[PDB]
Design an enzyme around this catalytic site. Structure first.
Site, PDB file in Angstrom:
ATOM      1  N   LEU A  21      74.815  -4.248  32.417  1.00  0.00           N
ATOM      2  CA  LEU A  21      73.849  -4.920  33.286  1.00  0.00           C
ATOM      3  C   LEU A  21      72.855  -3.963  33.946  1.00  0.00           C
ATOM      4  O   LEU A  21      73.177  -2.797  34.247  1.00  0.00           O
ATOM      5  CB  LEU A  21      74.587  -5.641  34.403  1.00  0.00           C
ATOM      6  N   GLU A  23      70.134  -2.530  32.794  1.00  0.00           N
ATOM      7  CA  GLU A  23      69.617  -1.442  31.929  1.00  0.00           C
ATOM      8  C   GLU A  23      69.721  -0.041  32.580  1.00  0.00           C
ATOM      9  O   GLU A  23      68.762   0.733  32.615  1.00  0.00           O
ATOM     10  CB  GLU A  23      68.165  -1.746  31.487  1.00  0.00           C
ATOM     11  N   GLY A  24      70.875   0.258  33.152  1.00  0.00           N
ATOM     12  CA  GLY A  24      71.098   1.550  33.786  1.00  0.00           C
ATOM     13  C   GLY A  24      70.403   1.866  35.119  1.00  0.00           C
ATOM     14  O   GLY A  24      70.573   2.962  35.625  1.00  0.00           O
ATOM     15  N   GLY A  27      73.182   2.481  37.666  1.00  0.00           N
ATOM     16  CA  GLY A  27      74.274   3.278  37.131  1.00  0.00           C
ATOM     17  C   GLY A  27      75.042   2.481  36.094  1.00  0.00           C
ATOM     18  O   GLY A  27      74.527   1.484  35.580  1.00  0.00           O
ATOM     19  N   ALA A 101      74.155 -11.250  39.732  1.00  0.00           N
ATOM     20  CA  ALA A 101      72.807 -11.778  39.897  1.00  0.00           C
ATOM     21  C   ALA A 101      72.204 -12.041  38.514  1.00  0.00           C
ATOM     22  O   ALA A 101      71.639 -11.143  37.911  1.00  0.00           O
ATOM     23  CB  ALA A 101      71.959 -10.770  40.672  1.00  0.00           C
ATOM     24  N   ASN A 105      66.343  -8.297  38.643  1.00  0.00           N
ATOM     25  CA  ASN A 105      65.676  -7.770  39.812  1.00  0.00           C
ATOM     26  C   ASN A 105      64.376  -8.542  40.087  1.00  0.00           C
ATOM     27  O   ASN A 105      63.821  -9.166  39.191  1.00  0.00           O
ATOM     28  CB  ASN A 105      65.518  -6.284  39.716  1.00  0.00           C
ATOM     29  N   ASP A 148      65.414   2.845  50.399  1.00  0.00           N
ATOM     30  CA  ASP A 148      64.619   2.512  49.207  1.00  0.00           C
ATOM     31  C   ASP A 148      64.421   0.997  48.993  1.00  0.00           C
ATOM     32  O   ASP A 148      64.668   0.465  47.905  1.00  0.00           O
ATOM     33  CB  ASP A 148      65.193   3.155  47.949  1.00  0.00           C
ATOM     34  N   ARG A 152      62.590  -3.753  43.060  1.00  0.00           N
ATOM     35  CA  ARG A 152      63.556  -3.371  42.048  1.00  0.00           C
ATOM     36  C   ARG A 152      64.976  -3.394  42.585  1.00  0.00           C
ATOM     37  O   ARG A 152      65.914  -3.502  41.807  1.00  0.00           O
ATOM     38  CB  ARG A 152      63.251  -1.954  41.491  1.00  0.00           C
ATOM     39  N   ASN A 153      65.129  -3.233  43.906  1.00  0.00           N
ATOM     40  CA  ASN A 153      66.454  -3.250  44.554  1.00  0.00           C
ATOM     41  C   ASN A 153      66.783  -4.568  45.239  1.00  0.00           C
ATOM     42  O   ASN A 153      67.585  -4.625  46.162  1.00  0.00           O
ATOM     43  CB  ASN A 153      66.596  -2.117  45.541  1.00  0.00           C
ATOM     44  N   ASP A 166      72.096  -1.988  46.630  1.00  0.00           N
ATOM     45  CA  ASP A 166      72.075  -0.547  46.861  1.00  0.00           C
ATOM     46  C   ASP A 166      71.740  -0.134  48.277  1.00  0.00           C
ATOM     47  O   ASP A 166      71.127   0.913  48.483  1.00  0.00           O
ATOM     48  CB  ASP A 166      71.098   0.096  45.869  1.00  0.00           C
TER      49      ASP A 166
HETATM   50  C1  LIG Z   1      75.246  -3.326  46.553  1.00  0.00           C
HETATM   51  O1  LIG Z   1      74.416  -3.347  45.384  1.00  0.00           O
HETATM   52  C2  LIG Z   1      74.967  -3.096  44.142  1.00  0.00           C
HETATM   53  C3  LIG Z   1      76.223  -2.528  44.005  1.00  0.00           C
HETATM   54  C4  LIG Z   1      76.761  -2.338  42.739  1.00  0.00           C
HETATM   55  C5  LIG Z   1      76.032  -2.715  41.618  1.00  0.00           C
HETATM   56  C6  LIG Z   1      74.780  -3.286  41.757  1.00  0.00           C
HETATM   57  C7  LIG Z   1      73.977  -3.732  40.556  1.00  0.00           C
HETATM   58  C8  LIG Z   1      74.229  -5.228  40.363  1.00  0.00           C
HETATM   59  C9  LIG Z   1      75.035  -6.042  41.051  1.00  0.00           C
HETATM   60  N1  LIG Z   1      75.010  -7.257  40.618  1.00  0.00           N
HETATM   61  C10 LIG Z   1      74.187  -7.340  39.565  1.00  0.00           C
HETATM   62  N2  LIG Z   1      73.891  -8.401  38.815  1.00  0.00           N
HETATM   63  C11 LIG Z   1      73.001  -8.245  37.827  1.00  0.00           C
HETATM   64  C12 LIG Z   1      72.421  -7.000  37.558  1.00  0.00           C
HETATM   65  C13 LIG Z   1      72.757  -5.887  38.316  1.00  0.00           C
HETATM   66  C14 LIG Z   1      73.640  -6.121  39.342  1.00  0.00           C
HETATM   67  C15 LIG Z   1      74.258  -3.489  43.020  1.00  0.00           C
END
Ligand SMILES: COc1cccc(Cc2c[nH]c3ncccc23)c1
Length: 290
Positions: A21, A23-24, A27, A101, A105, A148, A152-153, A166
């Site tokens: 999920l 695309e990196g 992480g 999610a 994003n 940040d 995107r976040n 994040d």
């Molecule tokens: C607190 O935010 C985080 C913590 C761990 C992983 C991620 C990425 C992520 C969480 N849920 C998702 N669903 C779809 C794509 C990426 C994600 C966000």
């Protein structure tokens, strides 16, 4: 090596791992199905996201993933943040289970909804800003500074709920590479307040400046701030007091909100509390079309 915490632990055999999920960008993260997440309903499966250490992770990478998890345990639950749901810390690799999610994003979500699926109303866009302002008000009230905040976040669920991601990331601000790009090709320094960028001072007020950039992202439907502008030139723009132009199809009031968020004096910017109240009111008077 890891301490057991019965408040969060899920047996490893309850988690069916799936495809990668984000695309990196976040992480090593995968989609998974967790059996019996709720203790009341052990025969229900839930789609969840799962973060783990890459194969060649150092000891610091482990510390950082642990910090992230503990930060998330302390901050508590909120509808507009990505919430922790569990962990597998025993007899095996560390897994940090969080909310899934399905719509990606916010940048991507908005870009796909541009006129060339379903287009977004003016009210949906303001509603979007509001939900993110709500997530941030909650984080700020819990003493968390994001550092940040950007489209995107922000992740979007299957039911169009905006969730900040994040917010508990470990980062050594004295070792940021201002020239590093996000995988999509942009520069994170373009969301940073001048005080954060030049003097390394991060505050709730600098997060509010980042929120202004994100408001600009929402109203340009995933637009890129300062396209073609490299790091040295960005500094020059900031020192000269430059401010991005009003997006088309953005009201004078919402542009003024962005500008307030980019106040040269940090003390003079609105707080997230005030931004949530202002956005609530604007959502109520913004046209859905009909
Ligand atoms: C607190 O935010 C985080 C913590 C761990 C992983 C991620 C990425 C992520 C969480 N849920 C998702 N669903 C779809 C794509 C990426 C994600 C966000």
């Amino acid at each position: 090596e890891l301490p057991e915490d019965p408040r969060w632990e899920l047996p490893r055999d309850r988690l069916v791992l799936g495809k990668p999920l984000g695309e990196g960008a976040f992480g090593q993260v995968v989609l998974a199905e967790a059996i019996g997440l709720d203790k009341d309903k052990p025969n229900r499966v839930t789609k969840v996201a799962v973060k783990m250490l890459k194969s060649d992770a150092t000891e610091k990478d482990l510390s950082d993933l642990i910090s992230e998890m503990e930060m998330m345990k302390m901050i508590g639950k909120h509808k507009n943040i990505i919430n922790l749901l569990g962990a597998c810390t025993q007899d095996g690799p560390l897994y940090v289970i969080v909310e899934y999610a399905s719509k990606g994003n916010l940048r991507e979500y908005l870009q796909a909804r541009r006129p060339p699926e379903e287009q977004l109303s003016s009210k949906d866009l303001v509603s979007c800003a509001y939900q993110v302002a709500r997530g941030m008000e909650y984080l700020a009230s819990k003493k968390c500074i994001h550092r940040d905040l950007a489209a995107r976040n922000v992740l979007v669920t299957e039911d169009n709920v905006m969730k900040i991601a994040d917010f508990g990331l470990a980062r050594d601000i004295h070792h940021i590479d201002y020239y590093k790009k996000t995988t999509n090709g942009r520069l994170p320094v373009k969301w940073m307040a001048p005080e954060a960028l030049f003097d390394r001072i991060y505050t709730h007020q600098s997060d509010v400046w980042s929120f202004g950039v994100l408001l600009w992202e929402i109203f340009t439907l995933g637009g890129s701030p300062y396209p073609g502008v490299p790091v040295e030139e960005l500094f020059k723009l900031l020192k000269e007091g430059h401010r991005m132009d009003k997006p088309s199809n953005c009201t004078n009031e919402l542009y003024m909100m962005m500008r307030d968020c980019w106040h040269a004096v940090p003390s003079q910017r609105p707080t997230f509390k005030q931004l949530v109240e202002d956005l609530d009111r604007i959502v109520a008077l913004t046209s859905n079309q009909e």
